[PDB]
Amino acid sequence: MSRVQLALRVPDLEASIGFYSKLFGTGPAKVRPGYANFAIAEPPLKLVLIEGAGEDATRLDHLGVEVEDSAQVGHAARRLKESGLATVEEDKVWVTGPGGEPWEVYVV
Template structure:
């Protein structure tokens, strides 16, 4: 299973959840303060809403969610062979989930793409060490 991830900055996560629940006909798969994600079956989409007041309506990042770490590694090798570099992140906590992922580098217009798999749910937005050192916005950025 693979699906495109679209992560949006929203001014008000509650209002955004209401809109996207009606648009896609599903409730969020995960809700936390300032955060929601939807696992939409049709079309296959992982929609992530990140509350960033003043940034609403803008793209946070793009991604491809894949089934497992082997697929993350296969995709990273494929992209490396195609001449794209990446920034590796393994066993990181981000967006209330433990993940293995990498960020594709060098998009011509600066888009941020991550290829990732979710290893487990997490009670915190990102790891406790990272939480003490920086803000949540740094989690979903290469």
């Protein structure tokens, strides 16, 4: 299995933590200065909140797919490259959509 990662740059981290705790009925899995994440089972989602400093509105930071093991990351990396996309591998692999939105496929 795998789940989507959504990372949002938010103007107010504390405000956003409260909102998302209510929306998904669970508290954050990890909290750091300027950073929080939620691990949501239903719907399957890794939500990342990154505080933006002087942001007027929430915007997309990056997107991703969190997968079960490094083998899956390698499979995705090879398949994406075979499909003709430019990739950057780190475990994770990055690709960028034509409008500039970045995607990471990674394992935690």
